[PDB]
Amino acid sequence: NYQQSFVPSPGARPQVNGLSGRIDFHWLILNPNDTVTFSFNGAFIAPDR
Amino acid sequence: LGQCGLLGTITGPPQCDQFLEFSADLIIERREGSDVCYPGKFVNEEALRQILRESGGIDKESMGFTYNGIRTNGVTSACRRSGSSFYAEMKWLLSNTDNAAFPQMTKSYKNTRESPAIIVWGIHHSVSTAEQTKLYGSGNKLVTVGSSNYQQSFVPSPGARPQVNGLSGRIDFHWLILNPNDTVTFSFNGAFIAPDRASFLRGKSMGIQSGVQVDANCEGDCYHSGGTIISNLPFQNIDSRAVGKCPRYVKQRSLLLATGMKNVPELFGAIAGFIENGWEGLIDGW
Amino acid sequence: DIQMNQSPSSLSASLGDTITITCHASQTINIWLSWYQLKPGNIPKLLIYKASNLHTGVPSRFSGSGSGTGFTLTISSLQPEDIASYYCQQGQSFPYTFGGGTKLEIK
Amino acid sequence: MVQLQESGPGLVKPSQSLSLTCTVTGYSITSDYTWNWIRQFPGNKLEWMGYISYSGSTSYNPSLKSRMSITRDTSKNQFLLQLNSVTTADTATYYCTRDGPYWHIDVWGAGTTVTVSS
Structure with a gap:
C-alpha cells in the first residue's frame, strides 16, 4: 500500500546543540x-527490529 | 478590506497598499477580495485565513537582505501602480547577464522578538525552458528552505x-x-521570490463575511452576512452560520409562550371547570 | 489632505557627524515615503524609496528607515558634495504633498 | 538615460496664459509610466500639478481643478503644460518629472524659472 522514493x-x-544536519524518520x-x-x-538509516 | 483580499496584506498587491499594517477589532472581507496580481495561489490557505480573522492586525518589520552579482528589480506588467511593478513586500532575484550564469546564494534571518513571525517566500514556475534560460540561466533549480521544524527544497x-489575463506562468508562495x-x-x-519584511501580530478580533454596508451608529454583536441580529429572545430562525454571541438556530419559526390563563368566553377543575365561563365585564382583577 | 511637517527647519553639522531628519505625516500612510535631495544649483537626485530601499547608484554610506506616521533618514561622515536640501514625499493618497525642507549647515 | 528638459518664454503678463513643454529623449512617453509637472514657490516649497498617463489619462491637483490642462505629442517626444487666469503668485520654477510607481518619483528635469508680473 506504499511507494515513496525519498531523497536527501x-x-x-x-x-541544535552541536550539529546542523538533521535525520528524519518515517514509518509505515x-x-x-x-x-x-x-x-x-x-x-x-535502516531499522534492525 | 473592500477590494483587499485578506491574504494579500502579507504580500502587498496594488489593491492593498492602504492595508499593509492595519489594526482592527472587527475585520470584514468582501465578495470581491483578490489576493494576487500575478497569477498564483497560496498553500494551506484556509488555515492562514483563520490566523488573521482574530489577529487584530499586522505589524511588519524588515529583514535585511543584500544581493550582488544579481539584479533585484525584474518587473511584471500586471501589478500596476503607475507601471511595471512587483509586490511591495517581495523582490525578484533575476540574473544579470541574461543567459550567461547565476551564482548560488545563501541568506538568513533570526527572529528576535517575543512573538512568532509569519514568513512567506516565493517560487517561480517558468513557462518553458526557453524562458527559464532568458530569465535565470542554466542548470537545475532548487530553493532550500529550512528552520528548526522545517526542511523542504522546492523546485520549479x-x-x-x-x-490568466495575459500570463501563463504561475508563482506559488508558501509560508512557515x-x-x-x-x-x-x-x-x-x-x-x-524572496521576502523582504516578516510579519507579526497584534491581538484579539473576530472575523465576519457579509455583503451589506458598514454601519457605525448601531449597537449589536451577532454578525452574519445579511446583517446583524439583536433580540432578547433565546431562539432565532434567521441564519445558522451566525458568528458572535447569538441566540441559537432552530428550525421552527414560531413558538408561542403563554402568559395568561385559559380563555373561556361566553388539573383542579375550576378554570374550564365547575365555574363555566370567564368574565368579560371584569377588567381590573384576574 | 495630508500635511508633511519636516522638522527642524535648519540645523548645523560639521564633518563626520551622524545626523537625522524626521518627517511627520499627519495621517497614516504607513510605508510610503521617498527622500529627495534638490539643492539650488543642480538637478535633483534620488536617495530612498519604499522608505527603506536606497536607489541604485547611490553610495552605500547613506541610509534611512521608518514606518507609521514617523520616518527618518541617516547621514554620517559628510562630504563637500553632501550639502543640499532634503525633501520627503507621501505617496499614499492623492494629491502629492511634499515637506518643508531642511537646510544643511556647517557649524 | 532618460533626460527631461523644460523650455519656454521669459516674462508672462498677468491674467494671461502660460505654455511650457518638456522634451523627453531615451524613452517613449507611451511606455507605461506617468509624467508630472512640479512647481517651486519662493521660499523653497514644493507642490504637485498633475500627470498625463502613457495612454493619455490625466489627473490634476484638486485646487487647480478648472484652470489647468496637460496634453502631449507622440511625434517629437514631448508633452505640453498649459495654465491660465494667472496672478502674482505663479512666479515659480517648474520641474517636468517622470514619475515612477506609487513607490516614488524617479527622473527629474532641471527646471526653469517663470515670472508673472506686468
Whole structure:
C-alpha cells in the first residue's frame, strides 16, 4: 500500500546543540504475509527490529 | 478590506497598499477580495485565513537582505501602480547577464522578538525552458528552505499553462512560522521570490463575511452576512452560520409562550371547570 | 489632505557627524515615503524609496528607515558634495504633498 | 538615460496664459509610466500639478481643478503644460518629472524659472 522514493536535502541549517544536519524518520505499517523492500545508494538509516 | 483580499496584506498587491499594517477589532472581507496580481495561489490557505480573522492586525518589520552579482528589480506588467511593478513586500532575484550564469546564494534571518513571525517566500514556475534560460540561466533549480521544524527544497515546474489575463506562468508562495531566536535559511540558484519584511501580530478580533454596508451608529454583536441580529429572545430562525454571541438556530419559526390563563368566553377543575365561563365585564382583577 | 511637517527647519553639522531628519505625516500612510535631495544649483537626485530601499547608484554610506506616521533618514561622515536640501514625499493618497525642507549647515 | 528638459518664454503678463513643454529623449512617453509637472514657490516649497498617463489619462491637483490642462505629442517626444487666469503668485520654477510607481518619483528635469508680473 506504499511507494515513496525519498531523497536527501544537503543544506546548511542552524545548530541544535552541536550539529546542523538533521535525520528524519518515517514509518509505515505491514500486514501479515506482506513485504517491504528498501533500496538505496546512500544516506539511509535502516531499522534492525 | 473592500477590494483587499485578506491574504494579500502579507504580500502587498496594488489593491492593498492602504492595508499593509492595519489594526482592527472587527475585520470584514468582501465578495470581491483578490489576493494576487500575478497569477498564483497560496498553500494551506484556509488555515492562514483563520490566523488573521482574530489577529487584530499586522505589524511588519524588515529583514535585511543584500544581493550582488544579481539584479533585484525584474518587473511584471500586471501589478500596476503607475507601471511595471512587483509586490511591495517581495523582490525578484533575476540574473544579470541574461543567459550567461547565476551564482548560488545563501541568506538568513533570526527572529528576535517575543512573538512568532509569519514568513512567506516565493517560487517561480517558468513557462518553458526557453524562458527559464532568458530569465535565470542554466542548470537545475532548487530553493532550500529550512528552520528548526522545517526542511523542504522546492523546485520549479517549467510548463505551459492556460493564460490568466495575459500570463501563463504561475508563482506559488508558501509560508512557515518562526519562534523566538529561531533562524531560517534560503538558498537557491534561480527562480526564487524572496521576502523582504516578516510579519507579526497584534491581538484579539473576530472575523465576519457579509455583503451589506458598514454601519457605525448601531449597537449589536451577532454578525452574519445579511446583517446583524439583536433580540432578547433565546431562539432565532434567521441564519445558522451566525458568528458572535447569538441566540441559537432552530428550525421552527414560531413558538408561542403563554402568559395568561385559559380563555373561556361566553388539573383542579375550576378554570374550564365547575365555574363555566370567564368574565368579560371584569377588567381590573384576574 | 495630508500635511508633511519636516522638522527642524535648519540645523548645523560639521564633518563626520551622524545626523537625522524626521518627517511627520499627519495621517497614516504607513510605508510610503521617498527622500529627495534638490539643492539650488543642480538637478535633483534620488536617495530612498519604499522608505527603506536606497536607489541604485547611490553610495552605500547613506541610509534611512521608518514606518507609521514617523520616518527618518541617516547621514554620517559628510562630504563637500553632501550639502543640499532634503525633501520627503507621501505617496499614499492623492494629491502629492511634499515637506518643508531642511537646510544643511556647517557649524 | 532618460533626460527631461523644460523650455519656454521669459516674462508672462498677468491674467494671461502660460505654455511650457518638456522634451523627453531615451524613452517613449507611451511606455507605461506617468509624467508630472512640479512647481517651486519662493521660499523653497514644493507642490504637485498633475500627470498625463502613457495612454493619455490625466489627473490634476484638486485646487487647480478648472484652470489647468496637460496634453502631449507622440511625434517629437514631448508633452505640453498649459495654465491660465494667472496672478502674482505663479512666479515659480517648474520641474517636468517622470514619475515612477506609487513607490516614488524617479527622473527629474532641471527646471526653469517663470515670472508673472506686468
